[PDB]
Design a protein around this nucleic acid. Structure first.
Length: 149
DNA sequence: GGAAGCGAAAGTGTCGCAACCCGAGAGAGGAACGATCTCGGGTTGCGACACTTTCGCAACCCTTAATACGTTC
């Protein structure tokens, strides 16, 4: 079903989408970006074909997002984030470790199952394709380690 | 995650030393042998340290990226 939706959006055949997705988790280019002081960050960008599929997926399936989430939100950003705290005198900042690379298929599906707001329901057959759309395989030899990039 | 080379941390084995034991031997006193002291070889326990093993730092960026200027993750 996910395949049919994507094929319709991308004006491609179900077969060519399915075929592409087989090794989609390996279709990433890895490069380095300089940090502002010393050193580098390592970035993995999906190939163009995969990016198109990923964008289509996000368009087709609306997932809930809390109002306190300020990043990657349409019509919001760093100004709104800062403004929320500008009237208060005391401040605390905390950070999550390896945030993106900590999110695995297991976490994702758990969140879908747990979700208090309404989530899209996926057929079990589609779950494998969704994992291939959304998660990167950093280690060629280890097919079992899939993480967000 | 983890190349290749490297050294920290921790456990095990080796080995040289010191203390001790033992029998051999030259021979003090004056005839009756063998008092006392030292040589030389061996055994044992100890502990400092050499050897051995394991872990873990982080190269590389996978065929697969885009390029108007900034900011944030």
């Amino acid at each position: 079903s996910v395949i049919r939706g994507l094929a319709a959006v991308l004006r491609q055949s179900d077969s060519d989408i399915s075929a592409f997705l087989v090794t989609a988790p390996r279709k990433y280019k890895v490069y380095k970006i300089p940090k502002r002081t010393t050193g580098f960050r390592v970035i993995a960008q999906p190939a163009k074909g995969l990016k198109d599929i990923q964008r289509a997926f996000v368009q087709l399936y609306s997932l809930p997002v809390h109002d306190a989430s300020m990043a990657y939100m349409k019509g919001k950003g760093i100004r709104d984030n800062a403004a929320a705290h500008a009237g208060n005198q005391y401040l605390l900042k905390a950070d999550l470790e390896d945030f993106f690379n900590s999110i695995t298929p297991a976490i994702f599906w758990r969140c879908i199952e747990m979700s208090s707001a309404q989530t899209p329901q996926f057929e079990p057959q589609d779950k494998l394709f969704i994992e291939k759309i959304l998660f990167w395989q950093p280690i060629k030899r280890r097919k079992t380690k899939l993480i967000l990039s």
